[PDB]
Antibody, heavy 215, light 211 residues
């Protein structure tokens, strides 16, 4: 049963080349059609191109001067290369299969990857400053402030606390993002047992833990 | 290229209601019209292909109809898990093109927020900043008005507010409101209050601490 994974850098400078990989498992790229799709901010989806089962590529004409899609059949991977990027290329990038027998002839993308974010900017990375928010049920928080670019990933107790969590969308202000996250637990679990927020910012190679201590 | 228009970008309906989402193409697309669902976590799934055919595994509550330029996706009875954004896609002519999406939100009974307030952390204060944070969690409807007061008077600026997407399990919303000052400004005042007005009470929600 197919799975698709997009991978590649999260931050690239204008004029440089964006290079992404789709790694396909549970199926083989020598059958069907293997597509790249991106979504700009404001939910604008764009079909960029594909590579066929025999290795022929099709490119959206407006991208043809900059784009190439190639593959490695022996590793079941296919690749997107986009040259000479600008801020207009900031998007979430998806790979998708058109292989399922019943649908292939109706030009549907029958299985999609999760997508991967790419930001195109000349700005340096800024890691988040992570601050603990301590005070029947008790609500605790983490303030994840002043980072660039998106995304960050926030977890609680390394993923073991997943219920009762709200992670608020990041907002851009003075050229940096800030978000916060809350977690609600029974009063009889904290502080007797520890609660820690974990924040990963892969663009700056940072991952930190902040224990919530009573004040 | 074929322009696909979803004129309605958002819809709100009750559990059990029937809803229709519609797509108009710039040309005759000969029934090559597919529909996708993207849930708030970002996962994209094929629901309907070739106007009206259900993709393997999709519930029969979904159907589709249309011809020429005009196509519809219909959900017979809305369910909690249908909170998502729905996109059309033409498959008549390359490059494939998509509608702008229609975000579907599901009504639920009104629900009062649970409110929490947090003074600046000692670590942030060591750096020279002072963010005061109020969470207003698990409420409905989404519209909520938050104001900050410092020593009893409204403070309009330095406030940043962010709402969650609608929770796919309970249909509530949550929001954060952060007042950011410098340490020096924070230390000039004693009382910090976040006050929210919401349709679930005639009194404001008031949560305060003294520095």
């Amino acid at each position: 049963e197919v799975q698709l994974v997009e991978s590649g850098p999260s931050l690239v400078k204008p004029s440089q080349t964006l290079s992404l990989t789709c790694s396909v498992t549970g199926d083989s790229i020598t059958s069907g059609f293997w597509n790249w799709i991106r979504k700009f901010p404001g939910n604008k989806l764009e079909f960029m191109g594909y590579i066929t089962y025999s290795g022929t590529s099709y490119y959206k004409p407006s991208l043809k001067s900059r784009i190439s899609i190639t593959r490695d059949t022996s590793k079941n991977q296919y690749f997107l290369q986009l040259n000479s990027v600008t801020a207009e290329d900031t998007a979430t990038y998806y790979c998708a299969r058109r292989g399922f027998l019943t649908t292939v002839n109706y030009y549907a993308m029958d299985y999609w990857g999760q997508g991967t974010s790419v930001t195109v900017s000349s700005a340096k990375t800024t890691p988040p400053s992570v601050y603990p928010l301590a005070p029947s049920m008790v609500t605790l928080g983490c303030l994840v402030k002043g980072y660039f670019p998106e995304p960050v990933t926030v977890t609680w107790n390394s993923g073991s606390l997943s219920s009762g969590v709200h992670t608020f969308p990041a907002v851009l202000q003075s050229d940096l993002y800030t978000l916060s996250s809350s977690v609600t637990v029974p009063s009889s679990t904290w502080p007797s047992e520890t609660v820690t927020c974990n924040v990963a910012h892969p663009a700056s190679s940072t991952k930190v833990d902040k224990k919530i201590v009573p004040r | 290229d074929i322009q696909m228009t979803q004129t309605t970008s958002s819809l709100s309906a009750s559990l059990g209601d029937g809803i229709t989402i519609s797509c108009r193409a710039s040309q005759d697309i000969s029934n090559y019209l597919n529909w996708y669902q993207q849930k708030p976590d970002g996962t994209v799934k094929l629901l309907i292909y070739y106007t009206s055919r259900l993709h393997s595994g999709v519930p029969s509550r979904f159907s589709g109809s249309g011809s020429g330029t005009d196509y519809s996706l219909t959900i017979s009875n809305l369910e909690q898990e249908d909170i998502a954004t729905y996109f059309c896609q033409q498959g008549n002519t390359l490059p494939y093109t998509f509608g702008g999406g229609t975000k579907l939100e599901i009504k639920r009974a009104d629900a009062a927020p649970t409110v929490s307030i947090f003074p600046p952390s000692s670590e942030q204060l060591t750096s020279g900043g002072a963010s005061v944070v109020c969470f207003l969690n698990n409420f409905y409807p989404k519209d909520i008005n938050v104001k900050w007061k410092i020593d009893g008077s409204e403070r309009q600026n330095g406030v940043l507010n962010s709402w969650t997407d609608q929770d796919s399990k309970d249909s509530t919303y949550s929001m954060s409101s952060t007042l950011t000052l410098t340490k020096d400004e924070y230390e000039r005042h004693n009382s910090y209050t976040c006050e929210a007005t919401h349709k679930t009470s005639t009194s404001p929600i008031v949560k305060s601490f003294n520095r």
